[PDB]
Design a binder for this molecule. Structure first.
Ligand code: HEM
Ligand SMILES: Cc1cccc(-n2cnc3cc(N)ccc32)c1
Ligand SMILES: Cc1cccc(-n2cnc3cc(N)ccc32)c1
Length: 394
């Protein structure tokens, strides 16, 4: 089908033609749900439009939620203490500044050897077995460790934390109350510990900066909400980037050759992979005012879906071969991590995981096969990530 529809597991394999029909025939597309016309919204599919809308937080607000579903915020119950991804400046600004102190090059550097060790352990197990599900065996568990590092969770608690994490990620995709409470109990304790035993992580930095201090319960709640932002945004996305890259590389032995002969091209290749997999394929904003883009006016008070996945595939920005893998492209201004105030804090961490995974895959498992038609995609309309990638190595 080329007709716009929110994605499902069944339609994640090939959304590209429908994006292309939008970009070409209706770049400011009005969706009026036949069974709910009251809940009409707009969809932006071109790079220029998505890039500007993402930046323009004044016109395009995150404060009412990030889906196309009106009433999202009250329905999930996030009004009183909304996460940072659903705050606009100026409210968003100070917290972002404080938590950013936990997202510097040092933090990505300190976890990289741990990432590499794990990737190696799992890839070697897979090789010995002649393959297995690279998602289950590696692409799922890996990002949970990195989120744990950024939250300053002691390594000894990573297994318990990964349990809560997998429950939450599953419940959140398309429901995890024990996990939510375990996590909220664990972090209440960790926060208290960081008051006297601070490290260089985001939670420590927030505590050291006084968030939650002196009976400031709102401050403490905001740290808890942040842990949820980290778990719900830092796992499934990475798994989509890693798993989604597998078919792309498999079908292009010429592109793998480029990197096998020149492993220094791997960082640029990671950017091209982030462009094409765009794990966050779309997120919404709410207009705060009428805005006209070309011949269409979007009324104030409507949701607008920013199709990052389409923007990243826009021939107007990347040329008529936008749909193809070119590891030497060095694509600029990709939308994979958004743009503006909310630009992904975990961008460097995600890039590092991709670089390490790709590097080791090519060194350890270069003769590998993936059956694309056997990949199973997660449900949910915003993030594209596989639940299973059947993987064989010779
Ligand atoms: C390839 C994987 C990832 C992708 C595609 C991704 C994408 C994004 C996007 C699109 C946003 C902004 C959402 C919006 O437009 O409203 C965002 C925000 C955020 N991401 Fe990621 N992300 C990834 C990995 C991670 C990781 C690993 C972490 C943690 C280590 C992380 C932490 C965050 C945080 C804390 C925010 C909120 C920033 C703010 O609202 O100011 N992300 N991410
Ligand atoms: C205190 C608290 C409790 C429960 C959930 C959250 N929470 C914060 N950001 C969230 C994002 C998603 N997608 C889901 C739940 C979230 C926060
Ligand atoms: C808390 C919340 C609520 C709703 C959507 C998202 N969301 C969508 N793409 C995301 C990517 C990251 N890294 C983090 C959150 C994301 C997050």
């Amino acid at each position: 089908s080329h007709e716009f529809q929110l994605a499902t597991a069944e339609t994640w394999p090939n959304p590209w033609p429908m994006y292309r029909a939008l970009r070409d025939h209706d770049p400011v597309h009005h969706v009026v749900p036949p069974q709910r016309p009251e809940y009409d919204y707009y969809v932006l599919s071109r790079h220029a439009d998505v890039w500007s809308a993402a930046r323009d937080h004044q016109t395009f607000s995150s404060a009412q939620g990030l889906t196309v579903n009106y009433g999202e915020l009250e329905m999930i119950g996030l009004h009183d203490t909304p996460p940072m991804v659903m705050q606009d400046p100026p409210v968003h600004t100070e917290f972002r500044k404080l938590v950013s102190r936990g997202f510097t090059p040092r933090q990505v550097e300190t976890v990289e050897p741990t990432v590499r060790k794990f990737v190696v352990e799992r890839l070697e197990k897979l090789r010995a077995n002649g393959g297995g599900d690279i998602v289950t065996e590696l692409f799922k568990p890996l990002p949970s460790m990195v989120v744990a590092h950024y939250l300053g969770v002691p390594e000894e608690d990573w297994t318990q934390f990964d349990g809560w994490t997998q429950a939450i990620v599953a419940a959140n995709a398309v429901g995890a109350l024990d996990a939510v409470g375990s996590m909220m109990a664990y972090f209440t304790g960790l926060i208290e510990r960081r008051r006297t035993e601070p490290a260089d992580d985001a939670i420590s930095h927030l505590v050291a900066a006084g968030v939650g201090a002196d009976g400031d319960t709102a401050g403490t709640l905001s740290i808890l909400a942040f842990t949820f932002t980290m778990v719900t945004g830092g796992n499934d996305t990475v798994t989509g980037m890693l798993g989604g890259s597998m078919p792309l590389l498999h079908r292009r032995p010429d592109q793998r050759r480029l990197l096998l002969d020149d492993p220094e091209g791997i960082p640029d290749a990671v950017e091209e992979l982030l462009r094409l997999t765009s794990p966050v394929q779309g997120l919404a904003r709410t207009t705060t005012r009428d805005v006209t883009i070309g011949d269409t006016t979007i009324p104030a008070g409507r949701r607008v879906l920013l199709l990052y996945g389409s923007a990243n595939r826009d021939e107007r920005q990347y040329g008529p071969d936008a749909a193809e893998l070119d590891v030497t492209r060095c694509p600029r201004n990709i939308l994979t991590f958004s743009h503006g105030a909310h630009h992904c804090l975990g961008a460097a961490a995600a890039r590092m995981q991709c670089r390490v995974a790709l590097t080791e895959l090519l060194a350890r498992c270069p003769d590998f096969e993936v059956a694309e038609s056997r990949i199973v995609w997660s449900g949910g309309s915003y993030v594209r990530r596989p639940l299973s990638v059947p993987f064989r190595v010779t």
